[PDB]
Design an enzyme around this catalytic site. Sequence first.
Site, mmCIF file in Angstrom:
data_model
loop_
_atom_site.group_PDB
_atom_site.id
_atom_site.type_symbol
_atom_site.label_atom_id
_atom_site.label_comp_id
_atom_site.label_asym_id
_atom_site.label_seq_id
_atom_site.Cartn_x
_atom_site.Cartn_y
_atom_site.Cartn_z
ATOM 1 N N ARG B 47 0.448 53.607 42.456
ATOM 2 C CA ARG B 47 0.126 54.069 41.123
ATOM 3 C C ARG B 47 0.272 52.871 40.180
ATOM 4 O O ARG B 47 -0.675 52.484 39.495
ATOM 5 C CB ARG B 47 1.090 55.188 40.724
ATOM 6 N N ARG B 71 13.270 52.902 33.736
ATOM 7 C CA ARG B 71 12.895 54.213 34.233
ATOM 8 C C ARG B 71 13.376 54.392 35.660
ATOM 9 O O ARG B 71 14.137 55.308 35.960
ATOM 10 C CB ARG B 71 11.377 54.357 34.177
ATOM 11 N N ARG B 145 17.979 27.959 21.454
ATOM 12 C CA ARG B 145 16.982 27.118 22.115
ATOM 13 C C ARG B 145 16.228 27.922 23.179
ATOM 14 O O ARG B 145 16.261 27.581 24.365
ATOM 15 C CB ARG B 145 17.644 25.895 22.762
ATOM 16 N N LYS B 163 16.349 36.496 33.438
ATOM 17 C CA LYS B 163 17.030 35.643 34.395
ATOM 18 C C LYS B 163 17.779 36.506 35.390
ATOM 19 O O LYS B 163 17.874 36.171 36.568
ATOM 20 C CB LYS B 163 18.018 34.717 33.688
ATOM 21 N N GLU B 235 22.781 30.257 29.042
ATOM 22 C CA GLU B 235 21.353 29.990 29.010
ATOM 23 C C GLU B 235 20.790 29.845 27.625
ATOM 24 O O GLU B 235 21.075 30.639 26.737
ATOM 25 C CB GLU B 235 20.576 31.088 29.735
ATOM 26 N N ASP B 236 19.979 28.814 27.455
ATOM 27 C CA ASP B 236 19.308 28.539 26.200
ATOM 28 C C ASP B 236 20.143 28.475 24.911
ATOM 29 O O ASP B 236 19.839 29.146 23.913
ATOM 30 C CB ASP B 236 18.148 29.524 26.046
ATOM 31 N N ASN B 239 21.516 22.198 22.151
ATOM 32 C CA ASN B 239 21.975 20.996 22.833
ATOM 33 C C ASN B 239 23.484 20.780 22.696
ATOM 34 O O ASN B 239 24.217 20.783 23.690
ATOM 35 C CB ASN B 239 21.243 19.786 22.263
ATOM 36 N N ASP B 258 22.712 26.726 33.057
ATOM 37 C CA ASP B 258 21.437 26.679 33.729
ATOM 38 C C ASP B 258 20.503 25.599 33.246
ATOM 39 O O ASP B 258 19.897 24.901 34.044
ATOM 40 C CB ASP B 258 20.743 28.017 33.595
ATOM 41 N N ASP B 259 20.372 25.460 31.935
ATOM 42 C CA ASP B 259 19.464 24.462 31.420
ATOM 43 C C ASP B 259 19.909 23.043 31.743
ATOM 44 O O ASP B 259 19.087 22.134 31.789
ATOM 45 C CB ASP B 259 19.306 24.626 29.914
ATOM 46 N N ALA B 292 15.721 13.746 25.772
ATOM 47 C CA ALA B 292 17.023 13.236 26.182
ATOM 48 C C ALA B 292 18.093 14.257 25.850
ATOM 49 O O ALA B 292 19.196 13.906 25.437
ATOM 50 C CB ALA B 292 17.312 11.910 25.473
ATOM 51 N N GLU B 294 19.564 18.480 26.945
ATOM 52 C CA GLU B 294 20.152 19.193 28.061
ATOM 53 C C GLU B 294 19.582 18.833 29.424
ATOM 54 O O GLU B 294 20.256 18.199 30.231
ATOM 55 C CB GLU B 294 20.040 20.706 27.842
ATOM 56 N N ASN B 401 8.818 24.366 29.077
ATOM 57 C CA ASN B 401 8.230 25.704 29.069
ATOM 58 C C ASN B 401 8.186 26.165 27.629
ATOM 59 O O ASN B 401 8.939 25.655 26.796
ATOM 60 C CB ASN B 401 9.106 26.710 29.824
ATOM 61 N N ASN B 446 11.057 24.750 38.537
ATOM 62 C CA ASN B 446 11.753 25.701 37.695
ATOM 63 C C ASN B 446 13.085 26.052 38.325
ATOM 64 O O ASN B 446 13.163 26.279 39.535
ATOM 65 C CB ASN B 446 10.930 26.962 37.534
HETATM 66 N N1 LIG Z 1 11.420 23.927 34.044
HETATM 67 C C1 LIG Z 1 12.730 24.209 34.005
HETATM 68 O O1 LIG Z 1 13.354 24.657 34.976
HETATM 69 C C2 LIG Z 1 13.438 23.954 32.632
HETATM 70 C C3 LIG Z 1 14.836 24.180 32.477
HETATM 71 C C4 LIG Z 1 15.499 23.903 31.239
HETATM 72 C C5 LIG Z 1 14.763 23.421 30.153
HETATM 73 N N2 LIG Z 1 13.343 23.207 30.300
HETATM 74 C C6 LIG Z 1 12.496 22.823 29.150
HETATM 75 O O2 LIG Z 1 12.789 21.495 28.682
HETATM 76 C C7 LIG Z 1 12.537 21.490 27.232
HETATM 77 C C8 LIG Z 1 13.694 20.843 26.484
HETATM 78 O O3 LIG Z 1 14.923 21.495 26.806
HETATM 79 P P1 LIG Z 1 16.323 20.739 26.591
HETATM 80 O O4 LIG Z 1 17.384 21.643 27.059
HETATM 81 O O5 LIG Z 1 16.233 19.378 27.139
HETATM 82 O O6 LIG Z 1 16.396 20.647 25.023
HETATM 83 P P2 LIG Z 1 17.295 19.875 23.951
HETATM 84 O O7 LIG Z 1 17.150 20.568 22.671
HETATM 85 O O8 LIG Z 1 18.648 19.689 24.519
HETATM 86 O O9 LIG Z 1 16.641 18.435 23.874
HETATM 87 C C9 LIG Z 1 15.285 18.245 23.508
HETATM 88 C C10 LIG Z 1 15.015 16.760 23.499
HETATM 89 O O10 LIG Z 1 13.576 16.517 23.385
HETATM 90 C C11 LIG Z 1 13.400 15.524 22.332
HETATM 91 N N3 LIG Z 1 12.094 15.624 21.686
HETATM 92 C C12 LIG Z 1 11.620 16.646 20.897
HETATM 93 N N4 LIG Z 1 10.386 16.321 20.475
HETATM 94 C C13 LIG Z 1 10.160 15.146 21.012
HETATM 95 C C14 LIG Z 1 8.972 14.468 20.829
HETATM 96 N N5 LIG Z 1 8.000 14.959 20.065
HETATM 97 N N6 LIG Z 1 8.839 13.257 21.465
HETATM 98 C C15 LIG Z 1 9.858 12.767 22.240
HETATM 99 N N7 LIG Z 1 11.023 13.480 22.383
HETATM 100 C C16 LIG Z 1 11.158 14.695 21.751
HETATM 101 C C17 LIG Z 1 14.519 15.748 21.403
HETATM 102 O O11 LIG Z 1 14.796 14.597 20.586
HETATM 103 C C18 LIG Z 1 15.661 16.096 22.308
HETATM 104 O O12 LIG Z 1 16.365 14.882 22.709
HETATM 105 C C19 LIG Z 1 12.360 22.914 26.807
HETATM 106 O O13 LIG Z 1 11.012 23.149 26.429
HETATM 107 C C20 LIG Z 1 12.698 23.731 27.993
HETATM 108 O O14 LIG Z 1 11.881 24.891 28.078
HETATM 109 C C21 LIG Z 1 12.703 23.472 31.538
HETATM 110 O O1 LIG Z 2 14.817 29.588 30.769
HETATM 111 C C1 LIG Z 2 14.339 28.838 31.623
HETATM 112 O O2 LIG Z 2 13.743 29.313 32.591
HETATM 113 C C2 LIG Z 2 14.515 27.338 31.504
HETATM 114 O O3 LIG Z 2 15.904 27.024 31.575
HETATM 115 C C3 LIG Z 2 13.941 26.819 30.186
HETATM 116 O O4 LIG Z 2 14.647 26.755 29.192
HETATM 117 O O5 LIG Z 2 12.774 26.432 30.108
HETATM 118 MG MG LIG Z 3 16.538 28.195 29.767
#
Ligand SMILES: NC(=O)c1ccc[n+]([C@@H]2O[C@H](COP(=O)([O-])OP(=O)(O)OC[C@H]3O[C@@H](n4cnc5c(N)ncnc54)[C@H](O)[C@@H]3O)[C@@H](O)[C@H]2O)c1
Ligand SMILES: O=C([O-])C(O)C(=O)[O-]
Ligand SMILES: [Mg+2]
Lengths: 553, 553, 553
Positions: B47, B71, B145, B163, B235-236, B239, B258-259, B292, B294, B401, B446
């Site tokens: 269904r 549900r 974040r 998650k 999570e999220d 920084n 996680d991040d 640079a 998380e 993402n 991921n």
């Molecule tokens: N694929 C996965 O499994 C996964 C897991 C965690 C986070 N992420 C992704 O990584 C991204 C960042 O997460 P985070 O935890 O590192 O964040 P954060 O906030 O800790 O750091 C972000 C960094 O990116 C830099 N930044 C932002 N704009 C920029 C630009 N225009 N040019 C150059 N540098 C720039 C910032 O100065 C900062 O140092 C998010 O979009 C998140 O979705 C992916």
């Molecule tokens: O939430 C997520 O799957 C990942 O850690 C991200 O922030 O992009």
């Molecule tokens: Mg996350």
Amino acid sequence: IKEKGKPLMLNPRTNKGMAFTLQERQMLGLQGLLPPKIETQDIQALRFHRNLKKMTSPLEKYIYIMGIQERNEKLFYRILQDDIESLMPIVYTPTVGLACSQYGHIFRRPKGLFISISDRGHVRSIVDNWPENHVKAVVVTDGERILGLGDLGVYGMGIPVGKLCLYTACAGIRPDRCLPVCIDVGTDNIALLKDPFYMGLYQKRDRTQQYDDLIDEFMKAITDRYGRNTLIQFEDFGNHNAFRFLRKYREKYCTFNDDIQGTAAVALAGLLAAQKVISKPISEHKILFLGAGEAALGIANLIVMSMVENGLSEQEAQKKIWMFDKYGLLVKGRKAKIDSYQEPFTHSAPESIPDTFEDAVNILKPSTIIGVAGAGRLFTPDVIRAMASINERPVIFALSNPTAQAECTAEEAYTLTEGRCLFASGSPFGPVKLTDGRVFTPGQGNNVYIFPGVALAVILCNTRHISDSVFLEAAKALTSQLTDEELAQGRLYPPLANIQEVSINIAIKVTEYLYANKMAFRYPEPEDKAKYVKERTWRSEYDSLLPDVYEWP
Amino acid sequence: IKEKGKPLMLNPRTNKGMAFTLQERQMLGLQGLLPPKIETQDIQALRFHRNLKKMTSPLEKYIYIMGIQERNEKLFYRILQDDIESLMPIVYTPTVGLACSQYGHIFRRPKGLFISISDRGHVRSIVDNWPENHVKAVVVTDGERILGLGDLGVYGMGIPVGKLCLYTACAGIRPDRCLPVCIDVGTDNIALLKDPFYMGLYQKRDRTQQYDDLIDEFMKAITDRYGRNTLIQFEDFGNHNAFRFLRKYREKYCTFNDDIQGTAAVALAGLLAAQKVISKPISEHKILFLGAGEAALGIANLIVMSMVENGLSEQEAQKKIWMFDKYGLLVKGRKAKIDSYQEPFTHSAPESIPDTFEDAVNILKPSTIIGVAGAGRLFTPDVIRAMASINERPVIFALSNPTAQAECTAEEAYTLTEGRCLFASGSPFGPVKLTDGRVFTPGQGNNVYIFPGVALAVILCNTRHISDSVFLEAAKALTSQLTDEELAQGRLYPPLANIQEVSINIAIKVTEYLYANKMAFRYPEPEDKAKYVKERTWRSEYDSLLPDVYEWP
Amino acid sequence: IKEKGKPLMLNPRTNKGMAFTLQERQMLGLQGLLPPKIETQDIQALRFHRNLKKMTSPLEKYIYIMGIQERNEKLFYRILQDDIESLMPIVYTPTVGLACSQYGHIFRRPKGLFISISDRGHVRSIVDNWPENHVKAVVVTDGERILGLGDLGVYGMGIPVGKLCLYTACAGIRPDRCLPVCIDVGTDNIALLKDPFYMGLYQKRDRTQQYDDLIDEFMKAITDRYGRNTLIQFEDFGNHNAFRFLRKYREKYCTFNDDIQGTAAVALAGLLAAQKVISKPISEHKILFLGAGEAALGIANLIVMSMVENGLSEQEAQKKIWMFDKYGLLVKGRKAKIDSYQEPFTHSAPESIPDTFEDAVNILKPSTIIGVAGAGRLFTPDVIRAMASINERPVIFALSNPTAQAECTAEEAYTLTEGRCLFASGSPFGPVKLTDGRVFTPGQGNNVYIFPGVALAVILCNTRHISDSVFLEAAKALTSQLTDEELAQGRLYPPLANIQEVSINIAIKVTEYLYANKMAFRYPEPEDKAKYVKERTWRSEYDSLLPDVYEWP
Ligand SMILES: NC(=O)c1ccc[n+]([C@@H]2O[C@H](COP(=O)([O-])OP(=O)(O)OC[C@H]3O[C@@H](n4cnc5c(N)ncnc54)[C@H](O)[C@@H]3O)[C@@H](O)[C@H]2O)c1
Ligand SMILES: O=C([O-])C(O)C(=O)[O-]
Ligand SMILES: [Mg+2]
Ligand SMILES: NC(=O)c1ccc[n+]([C@@H]2O[C@H](COP(=O)([O-])OP(=O)(O)OC[C@H]3O[C@@H](n4cnc5c(N)ncnc54)[C@H](O)[C@@H]3O)[C@@H](O)[C@H]2O)c1
Ligand SMILES: NC(=O)c1ccc[n+]([C@@H]2O[C@H](COP(=O)([O-])OP(=O)(O)OC[C@H]3O[C@@H](n4cnc5c(N)ncnc54)[C@H](O)[C@@H]3O)[C@@H](O)[C@H]2O)c1
Ligand SMILES: NC(=O)c1ccc[n+]([C@@H]2O[C@H](COP(=O)([O-])OP(=O)(O)OC[C@H]3O[C@@H](n4cnc5c(N)ncnc54)[C@H](O)[C@@H]3O)[C@@H](O)[C@H]2O)c1
Ligand SMILES: NC(=O)c1ccc[n+]([C@@H]2O[C@H](COP(=O)([O-])OP(=O)(O)OC[C@H]3O[C@@H](n4cnc5c(N)ncnc54)[C@H](O)[C@@H]3O)[C@@H](O)[C@H]2O)c1
Ligand SMILES: NC(=O)c1ccc[n+]([C@@H]2O[C@H](COP(=O)([O-])OP(=O)(O)OC[C@H]3O[C@@H](n4cnc5c(N)ncnc54)[C@H](O)[C@@H]3O)[C@@H](O)[C@H]2O)c1
Ligand SMILES: O=C([O-])C(O)C(=O)[O-]
Ligand SMILES: O=C([O-])C(O)C(=O)[O-]
Ligand SMILES: [Mg+2]
Ligand SMILES: [Mg+2]
């Protein structure tokens, strides 16, 4: 039912004890929570009857039996059902009075709904707190006139509790449809007011308008939740309030006052049986009451109602009734006040004005003497011998309760009158064997012979208001069951052992009566009332709690 | 289960819908409350799949699937189990992101536990309000974040909710042993502040000691009710807080980020696989992150850790990693600030200072490029063409993402480098067929590949704290499952179709590791880890609700 | 309310969503289980209307609004109340039939009580399974004649669900006091019988006495649990059975048949209105029905009831009505049989026997044409043009449902007769603007204008049996609300936007009537009926669930 597991054991309305079958057990999740043994109600009753025989004092037994009710309802009524004649004195008068007298000291678990004047304005929230959702009968009190014991305040909740017990034990009204209520407006009992175990409000009885709102707020709250035709029986209220509340709601709600009308029906029934033996001319009938309160005035009226119905006009009948209260004979122009209801029985003063009841008996020379003062042994041997001398077969009714407040005993009645009298007592008295071997078995003129069967019918017929004639009939239905052989041994009422069938029998004749007078509103009108009633009575036999499991084709 | 009747249907944890067998129906009082038909989970899932096909938008699909969770829990996970690879993009990235963006508009039923800074001092009463009594895993956010979407406040509760869905869907963690939490301390998102549908506090983010004390109170309240070793996965968070909180509690409670750490494991697994095709000399490696924060620091950490275990000193390992954030290249003495965690990767500026990331790629000439800024398409075609020119087989990671925040697409990666590159992205990307016929199937870097497996192990092992080396081992255990054939088609990760089995295999490897390092406290130690684990994974098949009935001898 | 915590949110009859006040959240144990925000019912409906305006198809909308009912009942009726005119076509005809058509595919959560022929002998156990214990209204079906869609078996529960929704949405009857019942005895719809999603018994419709037993077992089961005057409204049963049961129970229970008497009432009101514009002499009146079943016979008889009331004798009244069924005109001596009910309108054949409806129209030359066959566009343009030629002001009623089975459309009617006709449809139609600028607004001759207000009055007045006069009065009470100007725009019925007040108004006129005819048994008789009724109407505003806490003196 909707719950399973332990909660079925905690709820006494559902609890069976080791009587839960293995199916139920395994099925409802009780397995392992009970001993491997599966008993029968037969055995469960045995254990009780065996444990009870070892008890010595009645209040110890009262605490025991009443404790089953809060454990396993069905076994509790089965226990009562097993021997009503013997458990009556313990569960009902006189032991119930001694119980209330110290309710706060023997208190284990609470029973009934409690409404204090401190909740005025919220009486409905409280009502809504009552677990039962389909109440049909309420027995209410404020404990101002608990039996002949006076003002017991909240300690009086034992009264409505014990009355609703007889509702089920005698007429088979469903327990979950009854609701005992205690209105706490304070108490004038100073002993209670300085008692650390008192359960009510530590304040004197409030007698203002605040009091009247409360009963009003109560009546309305009750009917608002359970229906406009919910049976509300007022019990042990003060004289002033009993009459004013009866006249206030009798035509508004489905209400009646046990002490006023219930008592009337029973005494009239007993008096009726007495005429069966005396066959004295209605003209030469003269009655003197000891007391002029709720009971006396109620009995008086119903009696005049029987006279009217038998010729004698309302006036000529009322002239046959005299009353003696705490201030003396009720005669026109006496210093002590006479109320509306007494007026009709207050006559022009006799030749000499009696100072003592024995005077009244000698001045008036009554054919019937009915004690309803609740003041003690006011029927001195001198009064009894007086009667025995005035009447070949005097009728002496000592109806005050409990026993200590009775006017006299079965003992003195029969003995002093040399077994000529026609005795009746509100409380239990054993048979009386006289020197000359003769043995007299005295009847018990208690409203318990009326209110259960009369409440059954009113409930089953969805009657709107209870007219006084209903009690006239219930009195006839009661005295219509006295056999010539039971009459033969001094009984003015049927054997207490047979009270369940008597009740049922009364309920049937009363329903027949209600329907015949367009007072019953249950549709359609059962063709066979007898069958209609018996088919609807609650039984104490355990019911199956097993889910309805069946196969699909 | 201790309930019966309608409640079993209201509770999605117990609800089966039409799958309730007829016996359960009759025994549990459900008969009549459900249509005569008795379906199979198999039909139920049809269904759903039949209905979901008719849907046009993903958000509309998300609203629908998430709705089964409220549900029928079993059916919901069955549904995910049916086709995880196609349902993932909906229930998870990228659709989750879009769901969060308007959580307040698509709200039907609430999910999770909500703790606002306004409940400070009472956080424990809130925790005690959770219906489930044996929580083992908590995923918590303050929505600062949310993915690459930024501060979404209480609208970010969709993240912890998803998650934990992949906790059960991938690793078989009991759904009622999980708890998603939201810490609402306000939002800096003007738009949400002016939105009538926002679900949190209308106030800017509280960044005072009041906040740190709330987290603390939460950590304490949670462990006080469920146990010191209850899994808490952050999570999220922002920084600053992410790191602050992780260092602050990683040794106090059994918690992880996680991040920071989940991401690190997956980027390492992927980087590991990539080295298998390249087999480049450790000495020649050179990495450059775009971002640079998380993830970048978390990955840079684990990378270095690997390099050290494979020769290289932590000091020279660090020197192979470079970073480029929103202010440019992290170099010693730059105006923008570098922090405690980035110091090890901030080096004496190169001969020329890059203005743009493309400049960096040419001055630095890295072998690997890891995008994780969450800023959009920063890996411009030129950055791409630049890498393919600098390297024969460049390694390109676009991990931000959701899809819209990604540095580039597979299509651009592969086509721009002539199928030479080795790609991985954080969000789902379909296979790319080049004009020359070659078809590359990109892998998804991921953390969902890591957290479910790692979480199950830590729980099952009653582990107290989670060390970084545990994520190092989870990286090896993940990469050790990539087959040569899968590697052959451009996959740097095992197909997502086998995520469930990949997760459990990682689970077993991590448990073996924990017990091996005296970090597992579950007694006794399971001789056969593999069976120990598979023996305890939650299944989606309906269980029987019938009681245990049987005859007695 | 006796439950706290999560259970309050799961139960939709109590759930308020983010509408629970902070006091209630904290007090009832929901704090933390809901987002920090506290919404008003006003924003909750805003989210809904905004979400709904985005939906494209009505079934997708119907699924959205009906799900609210299963989530938050008070919000459901609030949205309904907000714009009944717009939501009517979705929640009711024509979308309800469309929903029914594939009930099994869109099935999410069960609604109503189901009783299959396989539960014969245990129907009472099924009723006892219903969560509500104070039901007052029941709408029951066997899905045999679902609208003009025929036999849909259990896929037809959508109908009794939707009717009970208008009970509350229009007459303010308490939702928890309403019970929709579907009786599954099989089906003849082969399409359903081979449908894997069908929700009923895969068997052909059982038509033996076993069927009669079941309906009887239900009738008793119901009244056994909820009382002898519980309202039982039979809906969409087969022609044979509809009449069979009406005749059989109308005097034993408090029941009526919507399709039979309901429609009568609404068609007569529409006819009556039209007579206000026509003023045609009773003498010159001639009516021809398209169809000769439940609806036609029901209308026919009420029409007659009115003509006899205004002079015309029963005999000469009937002479004014002709019926043309699937076998043609009902005349004396025709091969196609005539039953007891049609006998009265089965006249001696006219000069020439009509082969088509157009022929009957030109042979008989009726002043009124009432389509009620549910066979499609049988009021062909030729049939209409003929009517416009025969009558200056012809009355055309296209009463079949859903819209697809309607005899014709509003546009066809008005356009073909050049705005001269007087149209009324059983299904919704928009206004019609003629080339000459004139715009007509067609009325909706649907029993929805009747069953709600009539059910309210019967419930409120504790009526035991519903006579046919009741529907006569309900017709006058309805036509008496049409306004000159409303008429002015071609409305033979009050606007649908006022459907609530109209209902209440009809409800009051009917109870005044019931009481005036000694047919109401609610004691005592309200002096002011109007206030008595508005007094007791269920409202959609959230009630406070806060306990009654107050200080003691
Ligand atoms: N694929 C996965 O499994 C996964 C897991 C965690 C986070 N992420 C992704 O990584 C991204 C960042 O997460 P985070 O935890 O590192 O964040 P954060 O906030 O800790 O750091 C972000 C960094 O990116 C830099 N930044 C932002 N704009 C920029 C630009 N225009 N040019 C150059 N540098 C720039 C910032 O100065 C900062 O140092 C998010 O979009 C998140 O979705 C992916
Ligand atoms: O939430 C997520 O799957 C990942 O850690 C991200 O922030 O992009
Ligand atoms: Mg996350
Ligand atoms: N057996 C039954 O079915 C039954 C039913 C109800 C009441 N009663 C009993 O009747 C007794 C009185 O109840 P009631 O409702 O009539 O009370 P009440 O207070 O309304 O009336 C008592 C009357 O007795 C009078 N009185 C008091 N002391 C007196 C004395 N020393 N000498 C003469 N008269 C005196 C009072 O003035 C008053 O008129 C109670 O003890 C009660 O237990 C028995
Ligand atoms: N769960 C519930 O709320 C529930 C369950 C079963 C029955 N009921 C009620 O019972 C009525 C069904 O009729 P019936 O056959 O029970 O009786 P009935 O209609 O023959 O009798 C009329 C009245 O007497 C009451 N009654 C019958 N026996 C009684 C007894 N032994 N003790 C006290 N009161 C008694 C009934 O409640 C009823 O109001 C319905 O009005 C229904 O509302 C309610
Ligand atoms: N009604 C209850 O409260 C209830 C009922 C059954 C079991 N339990 C608990 O489960 C434990 C029994 O040992 P066991 O063999 O199940 O576990 P285990 O000792 O083999 O596993 C160790 C830990 O992992 C947890 N766990 C096992 N499978 C899990 C899964 N699939 N998802 C999430 N967590 C999982 C367990 O709760 C346990 O704390 C006891 O500690 C007992 O307190 C509680
Ligand atoms: N928990 C319960 O079982 C419960 C709680 C409250 C009231 N009640 C019942 O309600 C009655 C109290 O009188 P009242 O003031 O509610 O009404 P009422 O006496 O003025 O009206 C007469 C009948 O109409 C019904 N009624 C009133 N409003 C209704 C509505 N909006 N929708 C459907 N039915 C409606 C009532 O149930 C009643 O049987 C009592 O008969 C009582 O049994 C039961
Ligand atoms: N608008 C309303 O308030 C309302 C209420 C009830 C029923 N209805 C509608 O009325 C229609 C019939 O309902 P019913 O209960 O009267 O059904 P029914 O089965 O009892 O009667 C239908 C009649 O139509 C006749 N018929 C069928 N096909 C015909 C054809 N092709 N040509 C001429 N006559 C034909 C049949 O012979 C039969 O006499 C349905 O479509 C239903 O939706 C409308
Ligand atoms: O309650 C009783 O038994 C009686 O009414 C009394 O007061 O004596
Ligand atoms: O139920 C309805 O909507 C109507 O009575 C019909 O059958 O068309
Ligand atoms: Mg008394
Ligand atoms: Mg219908």
